[PDB]
Structure formats: C-alpha cells, structure tokens
C-alpha cells in the first residue's frame, strides 16, 4: 500500500561503450543502464549474476546498427531486446527470468 | 483535498542530453528537469523510483522530432507527453501517478 511495493532498482555503475559500424562511420555509443526487479529474491539474484547480465547487454548492443539506433522504432526494439535477452540468459543459467526490464538512463552516440 | 497537500520539488540533477535528427538536421539537445509533486509520500516515491522516471524521460525525448523542438506548440506537447509517460510508468509500477508534472528549467538545441 504505502510500504509494500516489491519494486527495486539494481544499479549497473559502469556505462556500456561499444562500436557500432555503418556505411560511413564506426561510431562509439555510451549507454548507462539500471535493472528493474520485483522482490528481494530477484534483487539478490540480479546483483549476484551481474557479470552474466553485463555480458548479455554487451552482446545485444554490439549487434545494433547505426540506423537502428537512429530510428525511434529501432530504439524501442533494442530496449525490449536487451531485456528479453537478459531474461533468456538467466532462465538458461538459473531457471528464472529475474528482471522486469532494463532501464536506460543515458544514451550518447559520439 | 489531496491535491491541496503541499507542493515540493524533486531535483533531477543530471541534465538530459540526447540526439535528434530528420528532414532538417542532426544535432544535440540538452534538457534540465525537475519534478513537481504534492505531499511527503509522493516525494519519497518520486525519489525512490528515480531510475524509472529518468528512463521514462529519456524514452520520451528519444522519440521527438527536430521539427517538434523548433515549434513552440511542439515544446508544450513534449512537456505534456513527458509528464504523462512518467505517470503511466509509475501507475504501472506502483499503481499511482506520483508526480504532478515535470518541469523543464533549461531547454536548448545545440
């Protein structure tokens, strides 16, 4: 009610920096992320498995193309795929999706 | 009468920087923002859910046009969309809107 929301946020402190390649430009993208989770058990799992979670994120991002990141439909696609990739990796590893979704708090492309 | 509880302002310290591009151009935007809330419980909620709020704001700004930034009508429209997207995110997460509205204290297209 007042004191009872299971929602918590797990900071991912280090920004993700990766190269996206395009027809004229290799570019660097920087993305600051946090994880949204429901409940103390999922929070503990998300903190514990964050090397795995960080590596899932990097793989999703590195697969992105330049005019996917320049397209408003493309950004929503990438955002949702980042969350669903993490859920799939954690389901393989621990049998649980663990997170609700990835949150992106900062995005700069060059 | 609930909407008569006292106003407070929750500062969002980090300015939003994001790219926009289309028929006219490709360039940068900086927005500095704060949240207007009513009452102590909404204020503590706005601070606790700051990762979700910041992510909603970045999502809203990512899907704006360089043409809609140059229109005075579009800028009101952007502000209102931003407030509505935050309220919808928090309604989905805790079942209350939490904020009154978001405030843009700096808005520049450079």
Residue numbers in the entry:
A (entry chain B), B (entry chain A): 58 to 167
The authors write:
FliL, a component protein of the flagellar motor, is known to enhance the motor performance under high-load conditions in some bacteria. A flagellar protein, FliL, which is a single-transmembrane protein with a large periplasmic region and associates with the flagellar basal body, has been found to be important for the function of the motor under high-load conditions, such as the highly viscous environments in some species. Polar FliL is composed of an N-terminal short cytoplasmic region (residues 1 to 17), a single transmembrane region (TM) (residues 18 to 40), and a periplasmic region (FliLPeri) (residues 41 to 167). FliLPeri shows a remarkable structural similarity to the stomatin/prohibitin/flotillin/HflK/C (SPFH) domain of stomatin family proteins, some of which are involved in modulation of ion channel activities in various organisms.
FliLPeri was immediately digested into a fragment composed of residue 58 to 167 that is named FliLC, and FliLC is highly resistant to trypsin digestion. Thus, we concluded that FliLC is a core region of FliLPeri and that the N-terminal 17 residues (residues 41 to 58; FliLL) act as a linker connecting the TM region with FliLC. The FliLC crystal belongs to the space group of P61 and contains two molecules in an asymmetric unit. FliLC consists of a single domain with a bean shape containing four α-helices (α1 to α4) and one β-sheet composed of four β-strands (β1 to β4). The β-sheet is highly twisted at the middle and therefore can be divided in two subsheets, subsheet 1 (S1) and S2. S1 consists of β1, β3, and β4, and S2 is composed of β2, β3, and β4. The two molecules in the asymmetric unit of the FliLC crystal are related by 30° rotation around the crystallographic 61 screw axis with a translation of 1/12 of the repeat along the c axis; thus, the molecules form a helical tube with 121 screw symmetry along the c axis in the FliLC crystal. The neighboring subunit in the FliLC crystal is slightly tilted compared with that in the FliLPeri ring, resulting in the formation of the helical tube rather than the ring. The interaction between the subunits related by the 121 screw symmetry is almost the same as that in the FliLPeri ring except for the lack of hydrogen bonds between T162 and Q71 and between D163 and V74. FliLC shows remarkable structural similarity to the SPFH domain despite the low similarity of amino acid sequence.
